[PDB]
């Protein structure tokens, strides 16, 4: 699984403050990889936290505990 | 069914797939709201990424964001910068 | 030797943080625990590392060896009011 | 003016962490870093106070401080 670079392009351009701003094809492909890693890292850390709490499943409460550090790593 | 709502659904689908894989690999399930939470979190992250990239490019007198801009995004983590760097040289051929 | 240098610096920071926090303490009619002021002190020393590393990379990103004001402004981009404050103090020069 | 960081001190903290020994910080950047370091310390302390005031505490303890640390780090 992975993000379509088209989608990633639309996400980024949605937030640029200057309309003249563009992103090279290679940078786009990289961002596609970066977004994937971000999601997977959030999920893996969610699981590790759920296992620590002896949870049945990764619930929002467990996810919320790993968010603060994740954001600081990215 | 607006434009951003279609964007959010799109990432939510990909996040779902990504989480499915992590779930089967680790025999731990994700609640629906967790996957949705990660999805919204991911949408919000694109905002930070986009603005940093723009400012980094601008810092270098450029209007076209390049791979050095992207690698700056990953500078916080040694493994991350290593992961993203190799990947960069991989697509440079 | 190395620890000596680092420890001397960390101590200097602890002192100044104490002085800083004390000002806030009487201005706001509040008081800090020694552990609180110590925690803020270690925090500040850790933040210096990130500031330094970012500054260096931001400069190199602009093909420079000397860190400048624009570099320091990048450090403060993550907050609108922080950036306003730093940008103002920057123009003040 | 009151309390503040020493330009010398700030400089040695930065050079403590630089990866390349060709890296030099300009005077203005150093003057600004002195100011940046100050607002950081001030923000933490001030946010700690607001937190303890939210709890009706008498002093700022590490407990309240820790509650403002995450957001503080995301702003800086």
From Swiss-Prot, chain C:
Main localization category: nucleus
Statement: the UniProt record of this protein carries the keyword RNA-binding: no
Tissue occurrence: Ubiquitously expressed.
One Gene Ontology term from the biological process aspect of the record: resolution of meiotic recombination intermediates
Entry's localization field: Nucleus; Chromosome, Centromere; Chromosome, Centromere, Kinetochore
Keyword Phosphoprotein: no
Molecular function, one GO term: DNA binding
Family: Belongs to the TAF9 family. CENP-S/MHF1 subfamily.
Record text on subunit structure and interactions: Heterodimer with CENPX, sometimes called MHF; this interaction stabilizes both partners. MHF heterodimers can assemble to form tetrameric structures. MHF also coassemble with CENPT-CENPW heterodimers at centromeres to form the tetrameric CENP-T-W-S-X complex. Forms a discrete complex with FANCM and CENPX, called FANCM-MHF; this interaction, probably mediated by direct binding between CENPS and FANCM, leads to synergistic activation of double-stranded DNA binding and strongly stimulates FANCM-mediated DNA remodeling.
Function: DNA-binding component of the Fanconi anemia (FA) core complex. Required for the normal activation of the FA pathway, leading to monoubiquitination of the FANCI-FANCD2 complex in response to DNA damage, cellular resistance to DNA cross-linking drugs, and prevention of chromosomal breakage. In complex with CENPX (MHF heterodimer), crucial cofactor for FANCM in both binding and ATP-dependent remodeling of DNA. Stabilizes FANCM. In complex with CENPX and FANCM (but not other FANC proteins), rapidly recruited to blocked forks and promotes gene conversion at blocked replication forks.
Protein name: Centromere protein S
Species name: Homo sapiens
Organism taxonomic ancestry: Eukaryota, Metazoa, Chordata, Craniata, Vertebrata
Gene that specifies this protein: CENPS
Curated annotation (Swiss-Prot), chain D:
Disulphide bridges: none
Compartments where found: Nucleus; Chromosome, Centromere; Chromosome, Centromere, Kinetochore
GO CC annotations, alphabetized: chromatin; cytosol; FANCM-MHF complex; Fanconi anaemia nuclear complex; inner kinetochore; nucleoplasm; nucleus
GO biological process terms held by the UniProt record: cell division; chromosome segregation; interstrand cross-link repair; kinetochore assembly; positive regulation of protein ubiquitination; replication fork processing; resolution of meiotic recombination intermediates
Molecular-function annotations in GO: DNA binding
One Pfam family from the record: CENP-X
UniProt entry tagged with the keyword Cell cycle: yes
Keyword set, alphabetical order: Acetylation, Cell cycle, Cell division, Centromere, Chromosome, DNA damage, DNA repair, DNA-binding, Kinetochore, Mitosis, Nucleus
Function comment: DNA-binding component of the Fanconi anemia (FA) core complex. Required for the normal activation of the FA pathway, leading to monoubiquitination of the FANCI-FANCD2 complex in response to DNA damage, cellular resistance to DNA cross-linking drugs, and prevention of chromosomal breakage. In complex with CENPS (MHF heterodimer), crucial cofactor for FANCM in both binding and ATP-dependent remodeling of DNA. Stabilizes FANCM. In complex with CENPS and FANCM (but not other FANC proteins), rapidly recruited to blocked forks and promotes gene conversion at blocked replication forks.
Assembly: Heterodimer with CENPX, sometimes called MHF; this interaction stabilizes both partners. MHF heterodimers can assemble to form tetrameric structures. MHF also coassemble with CENPT-CENPW heterodimers at centromeres to form the tetrameric CENP-T-W-S-X complex. Forms a discrete complex with FANCM and CENPX, called FANCM-MHF; this interaction, probably mediated by direct binding between CENPS and FANCM, leads to synergistic activation of double-stranded DNA binding and strongly stimulates FANCM-mediated DNA remodeling.
Family per similarity comment: Belongs to the CENP-X/MHF2 family.
Protein name per UniProt: Centromere protein X
Taxonomic lineage: Eukaryota, Metazoa, Chordata, Craniata, Vertebrata
């Amino acid at each position: 699984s992975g993000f379509r670079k088209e989608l990633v392009s639309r996400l980024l351009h949605l937030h640029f403050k200057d309309d003249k701003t563009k992103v090279s094809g290679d940078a786009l492909q990289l961002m596609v990889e970066l977004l994937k890693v971000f999601v997977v890292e959030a999920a893996v850390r969610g699981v590790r936290q759920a296992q620590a709490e002896d949870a049945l499943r990764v619930d929002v409460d467990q996810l919320e505990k790993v968010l603060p550090q994740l954001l600081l790593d990215f | 069914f607006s434009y951003q709502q279609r964007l959010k659904a799109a990432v939510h689908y990909t996040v779902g797939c990504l989480c499915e894989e992590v779930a089967l690999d680790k025999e731990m399930q994700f609640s629906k709201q967790t996957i949705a939470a990660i999805s919204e979190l991911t949408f919000r992250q694109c905002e930070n990424f986009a603005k940093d990239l723009e400012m980094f490019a601008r810092h270098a007198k450029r209007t076209t964001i390049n791979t050095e801009d992207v690698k700056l995004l990953a500078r916080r983590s040694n493994s991350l910068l290593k992961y993203i760097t190799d990947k960069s040289e991989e697509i440079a051929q």
